[PDB]
Write a protein that binds this DNA or RNA. Sequence first.
DNA 1: AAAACTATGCATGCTCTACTGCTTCTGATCTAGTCGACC
Length: 70
Amino acid sequence: QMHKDGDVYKYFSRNGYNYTDQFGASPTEGSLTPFIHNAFKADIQICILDGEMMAYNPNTQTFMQKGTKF
DNA sequence: AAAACTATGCATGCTCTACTGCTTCTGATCTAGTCGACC
């Protein structure tokens, strides 16, 4: 689950553990935020979202199911 | 011609400085195992 306020991002797991270190707390750093920051529309500054985090292979353009690996 | 003084060489001990071999300490590497958290 992702919390967004302006340029500030925060991520939480199923049981409540912080994961912002991995996914980035600002567009300058991270593994997802620098690329998803510009996806949001002009009028949206505060947001809470819930979803799944997955691994994507661009070569085959396919989701790699995280059975137990990668 | 005989006796006293001195020079030089050599033996002797002790002290000091390189080289080889044994023992111990450190670093580097690999292998095995543990823990967080997800599902």
